[PDB]
Design a protein around this nucleic acid. Sequence first.
DNA 1: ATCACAATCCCGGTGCCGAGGCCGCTCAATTGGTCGTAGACAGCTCTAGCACCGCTTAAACGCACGTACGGAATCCGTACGTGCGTTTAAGCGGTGCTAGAGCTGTCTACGACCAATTGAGCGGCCTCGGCACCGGGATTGTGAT
DNA 2: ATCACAATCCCGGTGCCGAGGCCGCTCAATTGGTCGTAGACAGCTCTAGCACCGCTTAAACGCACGTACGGATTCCGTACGTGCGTTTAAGCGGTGCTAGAGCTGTCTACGACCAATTGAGCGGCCTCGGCACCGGGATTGTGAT
Lengths: 87, 79, 97, 96, 103, 105, 97, 98
Amino acid sequence: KRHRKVLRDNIQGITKPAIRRLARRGGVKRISGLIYEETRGVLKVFLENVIRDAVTYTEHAKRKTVTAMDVVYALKRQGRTLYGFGG
Amino acid sequence: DNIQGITKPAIRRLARRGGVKRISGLIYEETRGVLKVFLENVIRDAVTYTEHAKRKTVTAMDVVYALKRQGRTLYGFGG
Amino acid sequence: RRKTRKESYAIYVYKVLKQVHPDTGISSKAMSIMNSFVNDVFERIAGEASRLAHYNKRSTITSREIQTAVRLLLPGELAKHAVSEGTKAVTKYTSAK
Amino acid sequence: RRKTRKESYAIYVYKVLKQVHPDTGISSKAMSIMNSFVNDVFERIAGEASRLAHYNKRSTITSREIQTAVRLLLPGELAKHAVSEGTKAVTKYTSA
Amino acid sequence: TRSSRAGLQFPVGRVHRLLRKGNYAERVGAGAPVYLAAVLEYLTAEILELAGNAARDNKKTRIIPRHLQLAVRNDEELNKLLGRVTIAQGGVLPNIQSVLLPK
Amino acid sequence: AKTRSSRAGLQFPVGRVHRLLRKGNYAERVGAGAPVYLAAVLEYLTAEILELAGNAARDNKKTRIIPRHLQLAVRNDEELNKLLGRVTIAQGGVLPNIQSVLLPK
Amino acid sequence: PHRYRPGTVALREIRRYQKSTELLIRKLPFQRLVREIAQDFKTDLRFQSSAVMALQEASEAYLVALFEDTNLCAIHAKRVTIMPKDIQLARRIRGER
Amino acid sequence: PHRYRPGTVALREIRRYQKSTELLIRKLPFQRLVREIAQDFKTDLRFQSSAVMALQEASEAYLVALFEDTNLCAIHAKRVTIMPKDIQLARRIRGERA
DNA sequence: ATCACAATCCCGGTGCCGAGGCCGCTCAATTGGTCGTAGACAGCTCTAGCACCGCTTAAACGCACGTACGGAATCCGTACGTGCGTTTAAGCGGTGCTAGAGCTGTCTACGACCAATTGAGCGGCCTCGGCACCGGGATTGTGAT
DNA sequence: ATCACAATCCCGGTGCCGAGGCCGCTCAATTGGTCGTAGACAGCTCTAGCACCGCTTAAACGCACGTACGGATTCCGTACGTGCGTTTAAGCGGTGCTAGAGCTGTCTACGACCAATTGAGCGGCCTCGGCACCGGGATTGTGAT
Ligand SMILES: [Cl-]
Ligand SMILES: [Cl-]
Ligand SMILES: [K+]
Ligand SMILES: [K+]
Ligand SMILES: [Mn+2]
Ligand SMILES: [Mn+2]
Ligand SMILES: [Mn+2]
Ligand SMILES: [Mn+2]
Ligand SMILES: [Mn+2]
Ligand SMILES: [Mn+2]
Ligand SMILES: [Mn+2]
Ligand SMILES: [Mn+2]
Ligand SMILES: [Mn+2]
Ligand SMILES: [Mn+2]
Ligand SMILES: [Mn+2]
Ligand SMILES: [Mn+2]
Ligand SMILES: [Mn+2]
Ligand SMILES: [Mn+2]
Ligand SMILES: [Mn+2]
Ligand SMILES: [Mn+2]
Ligand SMILES: [Mn+2]
Ligand SMILES: [Mn+2]
Ligand SMILES: [Mn+2]
Ligand SMILES: [Mn+2]
Ligand SMILES: [Mn+2]
Ligand SMILES: [Mn+2]
Ligand SMILES: [Mn+2]
Ligand SMILES: [Mn+2]
Ligand SMILES: [Mn+2]
Ligand SMILES: [Mn+2]
Ligand SMILES: [Mn+2]
Ligand SMILES: [Mn+2]
Ligand SMILES: [Mn+2]
């Protein structure tokens, strides 16, 4: 019964510099100009697949809140097990 | 010397089904090592299963169970 | 001689084959693949349903666990149809008690 | 109120660590990792044991299933040592 | 039989047994094996549908493991489902990379 | 020796491990040795990794294992690296590795 | 005044970010993105903040890991510069497509 | 005489082997290799004939698919010829190799 | 060669707060006894794994020959790195609000379990049409002119 | 293009064995009945997820500029494929020989299930030593000269 603002174009919050940093820690020294939009597209496919399961577990449990454990179990579902967040 | 029983023309046929047009000379020995490693890993696990069943004969099921373990599930042998 | 019993889904695969393709048959090898396929998919849904129950601290695997299992497992369009046939058969079953 | 009991392997992990580095500490997150590690490997071995029993039509999970679970699951040297450390425990357990 | 009451060719009796025998949980609901048997029958339908078309395309009346492979690997979603699966005697899809073709 | 841990000479809780094996639908029945073997293995691997991460902690001049010491630990050990090859250890980073061709000549 | 040659600051930054473990994507941007993608699956969802840290920790690690495979794809092609097509090669071979 | 340009029979064989489903390794050499590898794990062992068939079906499926990836790695390097380095890149990526 | 100098590294100082210890209450583990069935251990049945054998090919092999492919070498244009000034919003920390997570208690619908019953599903048997194999024209590309 | 000659495709005939159907037995599914307990639901608590605002400042953005990188081009050598003939062991159908897989039937050592006993492990509470954070000063490496 009150407004959420509307969320649009949030992919672009994954800026050029931020992607460069992740690239550095992956050991990349030179980055083509087209890599940024390509990286956003991959992050989004990744986030969609995982968030789709987290939510599937979350709806099963009849909750309105997504828990670390829904995410943790979704991660493990996809063969991307994560330590440090329960489980 | 048994490994060499996986011949050049045999590796070539596999490569062809994989869509490969041209094959370096060093590929043949490289594919022998790769296939050895694959079989080692699968047969090791198959035998662990036979062992546990207290048998002297490795069953298709031991292999099927091992393939599955390794993320290489196989249909048509007792799945 | 004598016997030695082994169950498979062969008869039901045939029955379904007849629905979808009345004028076509199936080899033994192909039949063994279908068998593998059903077992595999059975195990996969059942395993997921098992975990769902444990995650939620429940002693029971109900159709709701099978349903969620199907949605974690199956790809989009394949799940949609699967949920339908599932819910459908459950409805028809309880209304025939 | 007075918060829900949340079980942990924390106390054991601190024990093992005091034996092995009696002057070393461990942070929250580190222990949370240690704790997931222990659960993860617990599930993996238990899971493989369950399958072994099921495959052999056994209703029971014995140390022999765990043992084989460990051999399929652990890499080489890690397996060897865990097996001897497991058999030792069963042997020490069985007599006492 | 619970198959007929539910409208299924696939055995609901068998499937309820396998669920309890398979150490999935303490208890198994009544709807669970009906739901599951239906999903199994449906996926069986979907494969055999597409496998049969492949047998027809290849001028055959009997389905062999190749028809099942063509069915699966040409279907996007099925190929995904069985992405880590090997259909024995299946072969591959004919697909030559462009640069390999003569000009 | 009242605990099943003492009787086994373990730091890890055999009782709790026996509980979990039962409340887990692994099989109808769980043998008496199973929790014991398992609890010891869990203990063996625990000590194996803590060994290596206290060392990391010490190379790094620290009294405390933080999650990066575990990652350093795991990812430098061939065998631990593989046991955890599909695991991501929150807040542990990566190993320093720059590719050769990227080095100035 | 002074000017480092191309690649000099890049090399420096590779060694800097390989020493740390801190998340490299700013936290608000990333969370807004999370709530937006999740909103498009289901409306009125809340997140435990550690559910957002969990996805971010997994996400950043998926993308360092990938940027490694990508980098070796560049180098295979006798390049120093990573491109969209290196990323695509890596994801295809991973079986991610 | 008569001679096809280099690459023409290569393509004829691709079309051919992508058309069929029969095994491409000779059965007995493979069999003897399976027994050899297994001995080094446990001595005095028998194999079901179907167990060797299962190992051959799986092994070859593995090699065909690896050759597919190796080929892409070659093409990525503007080449037409597969080389050990393409296989090693494939496996590295598959996460088999380290 | 030589020489700024920017950036990084290594050093105690300093202040904030989470690791880790003390406590005492509680709930999960231990204790000892019943009771039932899984499975080990033995005894028998016969399936499939295995061994040596000898012809009939097709597949492996080794070689002659030469071309197209890989790689080394150079050359040009601009894309992508670096640095700077300006612009933008993340993070912080501090406040105020309630949705809904998560925990309790009550009661019953649902599923485990057993005894009895019955036909669906199994192997054993049979036979016949779908399809593998093949030879002899229909057609399609490949290389050469 | 327009030519001939490979290798491939396809078509109607021919036999051969496994798909597929019936058959009758039997074991797993079904029905009808008891008992207890999982969890659906209702009621209550208080955690933490959310919104929102002002302030500081570090990070993001965009623009200037030019180096070194990618790609386009030539170009040369041999590592490849193609196609002969000679060499070999895979494949098949054969008979013979038995390890050991696999099924039954006995029974007892082992684990489920239980109540009553209690001490390990939990959260609550508290505090100080480890380390994050900073500024200084020494070192080190890259780029100007
Ligand atoms: Cl149900
Ligand atoms: Cl035991
Ligand atoms: K046998
Ligand atoms: K809350
Ligand atoms: Mn939206
Ligand atoms: Mn200091
Ligand atoms: Mn604490
Ligand atoms: Mn203290
Ligand atoms: Mn005390
Ligand atoms: Mn029995
Ligand atoms: Mn070229
Ligand atoms: Mn140019
Ligand atoms: Mn700030
Ligand atoms: Mn805040
Ligand atoms: Mn409320
Ligand atoms: Mn509620
Ligand atoms: Mn009922
Ligand atoms: Mn039958
Ligand atoms: Mn002919
Ligand atoms: Mn015809
Ligand atoms: Mn039949
Ligand atoms: Mn009948
Ligand atoms: Mn309850
Ligand atoms: Mn260049
Ligand atoms: Mn034979
Ligand atoms: Mn014998
Ligand atoms: Mn025996
Ligand atoms: Mn006994
Ligand atoms: Mn006992
Ligand atoms: Mn025992
Ligand atoms: Mn505590
Ligand atoms: Mn400073
Ligand atoms: Mn300073």
